[PDB]
From a paper:
Before the crystallization of wild-type AtAkαGal3, galactose was added to the protein solution via dialysis in order to obtain suitable crystals. Our first solved structure of wild-type AtAkαGal3 was thus in complex with galactose at a resolution of 2.17 Å. The crystal structure of wild-type AtAkαGal3 was first solved ab initio by the selenomethionine multi-wavelength anomalous diffraction (Se-MAD) method at a resolution of 2.8 Å and was subsequently refined to a high resolution of 2.17 Å using the native crystal with the best diffraction quality, which contains two molecules in the asymmetric unit. The structure of the AtAkαGal3–galactose complex shows that the OH group at C1, the anomeric C atom, of the galactose moiety is in a β-anomeric form and points towards the bottom side of the catalytic binding site, forming a direct hydrogen bond (distance 3.06 Å) to the nucleophile Asp383 and to the OD1 group of the acid/base catalytic residue Asp447 through a water molecule, with distances of 2.66 and 2.87 Å, respectively. Moreover, the OD1 group of Asp447 makes a strong hydrogen bond (distance 2.54 Å) to the OH2 group of the galactose. The other hydroxyl groups of the galactose are also stabilized by numerous hydrogen-bond interactions with various surrounding side chains of the residues at the −1 binding site, such as Arg443, Lys381, Asp243, Asp244 and Trp307. Furthermore, three water molecules help to stabilize the galactose moiety through water-mediated hydrogen-bonding interactions with Trp78, Lys381, Arg443, Asp447 and Asp479. The structure of wild-type AtAkαGal3 shows that the catalytic residues Asp383 and Asp447 are separated by approximately 6.7 Å, which is also generally found for the double-replacement retaining mechanism in members of clan D of the GH27 enzymes, with an average distance of 6.5 Å, and in T. maritima α-galactosidase, with a distance of 6.3 Å. Our crystal structures of wild-type AtAkαGal3 and its D383A mutant in complex with galactose and with hydrolyzed raffinose, i.e. galactose and sucrose, reveal one water molecule at the conserved position near the anomeric C atom and Asp447.
The alkaline α-galactosidase AtAkαGal3 from Arabidopsis thaliana catalyzes the hydrolysis of α-d-galactose from galacto-oligosaccharides under alkaline conditions. Here, thin-layer chromatography is used to demonstrate that AtAkαGal3 exhibits a dual function and is capable of synthesizing stachyose using raffinose, instead of galactinol, as the galactose donor. The structure of AtAkαGal3 comprises three domains: an N-terminal domain with 13 antiparallel β-strands, a catalytic domain with an (α/β)8-barrel fold and a C-terminal domain composed of β-sheets that form two Greek-key motifs. A sequence comparison of AtAkαGal3 with acidic α-galactosidases further confirmed that Asp383 and Asp447 are presumably critical residues that serve as the nucleophile and the catalytic acid/base, respectively.
Author numbering: 5 to 102, 120 to 253, 263 to 749
Write the structure that this text describes.
């Protein structure tokens, strides 16, 4: 049976993972298409309760990685060996048997949501909550799912799909429509102006970016454009109407609102998309109590796991001053009127924020899962009507309540905010995004957030954004730009080189905490179509503290650390080979910063050494062997972080000793060749190239962007 409770012990492929499983902890593997290859888990209790907790079993000497909510809104990573180290509010837990990998997915079930928490006795406990006193239950069959396999990433995905086949209440990332913004550079006003943003600031930020040759094709007008008011210390603000405030009304004709800056953005400055920010509850303090939308004051319910990890939530302005919560009966009316107004003004999407609050406001109304479902149901209906390119970015949304009802939305902020003025944040941001994407990336495309192009950590953030697989945008104040940096990310038409997957830790890094263990470098892998990409980060020296309950610096024993890369760290690198059945695993590896090309045989390590807050990017291309002595691998646009993303087509013709490629973009193009090319041809005309006989690096300039909708350079390399 493979995954079974036998005696009081949890056994997986004949390894004990857990011991001492209570007698009340019930399994089942039946489903519509019966044979389930892992197991659903639940529990019978005595009484009708709105909160429950049962140990699943006792976990010892088994490496894990967990993603846990350090705050209501956001997750971060924790590794350990013992059940006691599992944090409160653990929403995703992956266990290594030493070869074999087990995932534990705490689920929503009816009106209940579960998570994992460790206790002092090393038991893994299942915490079950409705977030509502009037919604109570004694027995559950499907509040956890457990599945195991020998590829950690494939194990995760296979489990998620099985959970999806049970619930039918979400879709996986790859089944959703990505809105078009993800293929372009954007800018977001948040760090530029905070809430003091005006339409004149919008226009200035778009002009300053385009002026330097890296034009954003989307903008996020963030928090600060809505009509909000304090109740009639620090007071909370509530939405007073759905239309823009006076900073977004054309100064000349007060009856023309946000339409003005949209039309300026698009017509005058060439933007393809405009998005705006709003809280899932309208604003931070919700909507002002009123008839129109049924808004009535609600006060956040505290839950233990949340409060345990974030004690400041007890005294937070939202918690103490409440929110005007729009009624479930009128929630669709609210989103629709807001979004209809926005869409009729030419807005293409919304960054929907403060999302987890709903788990704390289910008191009257069905509890946490139900309130979440209802709001998202309405939100998704309005989005599909009003923003039909699927214009929704989910923010502050890292709860299982939301994730398991993520049926439509396709982009999710993967971490806590970029914080330009907080030195502790930068290493942590890189770690959180990477680890969180392991799980969040099964649901939606991770968004690794805005960043500053002018900042000590700019390269560190930007390089990470390049290999993220997600939208790429800055929050630069106007005129504070590093265009040399930006050209590494953004082509002259505003298109980017997006990788195809959520960027994730290598197999290598899944169980070794690169923020805390003091020994390991973080390696992040992604794919393009015909290359892999690998980013290496030192992100030691900071993390959330289990004692201080916040992000701090902590002690590190060296500044510099040495790890290594292998072609195969790029987990799916074989999908980039034009001939995987004959491919012997050899890769061309190009160091983006050092500008160095190395041939790396299958399994040969190359050492990499980095001080804290340093990084390196490598493009990893499968070598094709045309004949004995004629070997080749494309690299792409070598002065861009994700160089391989420029290669759209690749074909080998060994009978003619020829390589045929389709390449997007412009700038310097690089390839590995064992021999000096006879000819390099671009659009039928021979072009000059250089060749470094000792590295095999071939180079030539793709001078301009492809000529008119003819999307690609056609390149022939004759060897
Ligand atoms: O107050 C506005 C801000 O809200 C945060 O939750 C969000 O992550 C930021 O990116 C910005 O939108």
């Amino acid at each position: 049976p493979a995954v079974r409770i036998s005696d009081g012990n949890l056994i997986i492929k004949n390894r004990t993972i857990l011991t001492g499983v209570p007698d009340n902890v019930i399994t089942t593997s039946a489903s519509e298409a019966g044979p389930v290859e892992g197991v659903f888990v639940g529990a019978v209790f005595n009484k009708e309760e709105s909160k429950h907790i049962v140990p699943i079993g006792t976990l010892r000497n088994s490496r894990f990685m967990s993603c846990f909510r350090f705050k209501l809104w956001w997750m971060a990573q924790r590794m350990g060996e013992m059940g006691r180290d599992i944090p409160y509010e653990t929403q995703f837990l992956l266990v290594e048997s030493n070869k074999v990998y087990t995932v534990f997915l705490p689920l929503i079930e009816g009106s209940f949501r579960s998570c994992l928490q460790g206790n002092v006795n090393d038991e893994v406990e299942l915490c079950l909550e409705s977030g509502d006193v009037d919604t109570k239950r004694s027995s559950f069959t499907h509040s956890l799912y457990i599945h195991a396999g020998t590829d950690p990433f494939q194990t995760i995905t296979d489990a998620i799909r099985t959970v999806k086949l049970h619930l039918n209440s979400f879709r996986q990332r790859h089944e959703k429509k990505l809105p078009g913004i993800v293929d372009y550079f954007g800018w977001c006003t948040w760090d530029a102006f905070y809430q003091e943003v005006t339409q004149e600031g919008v226009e200035a930020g778009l002009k300053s970016l385009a002026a330097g040759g890296t034009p954003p094709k989307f903008v996020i007008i963030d928090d600060g454009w809505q009509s909000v008011e304090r109740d009639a210390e620090s007071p909370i603000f509530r939405l007073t109407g759905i239309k823009e405030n006076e900073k977004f009304k054309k100064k000349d004709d007060p009856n023309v609102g946000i339409k003005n800056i949209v039309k300026i953005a698009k017509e005058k400055h060439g933007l393809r998309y405009v998005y705006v920010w709003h809280a899932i509850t309208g604003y931070w303090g919700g909507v002002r109590p009123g008839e129109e939308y049924g808004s009535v004051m609600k006060y956040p319910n505290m839950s233990k796991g949340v409060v345990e990890n974030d004690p400041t939530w007890k005294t937070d302005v939202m918690t103490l001053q409440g929110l005007g919560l729009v009624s479930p009966k009128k929630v669709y009316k609210f989103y629709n009127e807001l979004h209809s107004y926005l869409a009729d003004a030419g807005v293409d999407g919304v960054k929907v924020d403060v999302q987890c609050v709903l788990e704390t406001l289910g008191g009257g109304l069905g509890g946490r899962v139900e309130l979440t479902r209802q709001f998202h149901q309405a939100l998704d209906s309005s989005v599909a009507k009003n923003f039909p390119d699927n214009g929704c970015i989910a923010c502050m949304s890292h709860n299982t309540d939301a994730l398991y009802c993520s049926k439509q939305a396709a982009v999710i902020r993967a971490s806590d905010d970029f914080y330009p003025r907080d030195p502790v944040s930068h290493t942590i941001h890189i770690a959180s995004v990477a680890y969180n994407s392991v799980f969040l990336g099964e649901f939606m495309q991770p968004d690794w957030d805005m960043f500053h192009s002018v900042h000590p950590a700019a390269e560190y953030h930007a390089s990470a954004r390049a290999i993220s697989g997600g939208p790429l945008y800055v929050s630069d104040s106007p005129g504070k730009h590093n265009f040399e940096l930006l050209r590494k990310l953004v082509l002259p038409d505003g298109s980017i080189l997006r990788a195809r997957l959520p960027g994730r830790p290598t197999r290598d890094c899944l169980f070794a905490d690169p923020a805390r263990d003091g020994v390991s470098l973080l390696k992040i892998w992604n794919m393009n179509k015909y290359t892999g990409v690998l980013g290496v980060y030192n992100c030691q020296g900071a993390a959330w503290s289990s004692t201080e309950r916040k992000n701090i610096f902590h002690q590190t024993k060296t500044d510099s650390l040495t790890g290594s890369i292998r072609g195969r760290d790029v987990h799916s690198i074989s999908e980039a080979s034009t001939d995987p059945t004959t491919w012997n695993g050899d890769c061309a590896v190009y160091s983006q910063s050092r500008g160095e090309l190395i041939v790396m045989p299958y399994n040969v390590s190359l050492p990499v050494s980095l001080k804290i807050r340093e990084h390196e990017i490598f493009t990893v291309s499968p070598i094709s062997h045309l004949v004995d002595g004629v070997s080749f691998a494309p690299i792409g646009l070598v002065n861009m972080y994700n160089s391989g993303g420029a290669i759209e087509g690749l074909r080998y013709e060994a009978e003619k000793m020829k390589v045929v490629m389709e390449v997007k973009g412009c700038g310097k193009f690089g390839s590995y060749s064992s021999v000096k090319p006879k000819r390099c041809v671009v659009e039928s005309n021979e072009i000059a190239f250089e060749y470094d006989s000792s590295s095999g690096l071939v180079t030539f300039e793709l001078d301009k962007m492809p000529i008119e909708n003819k999307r690609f350079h056609l390149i022939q390399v004759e060897l």
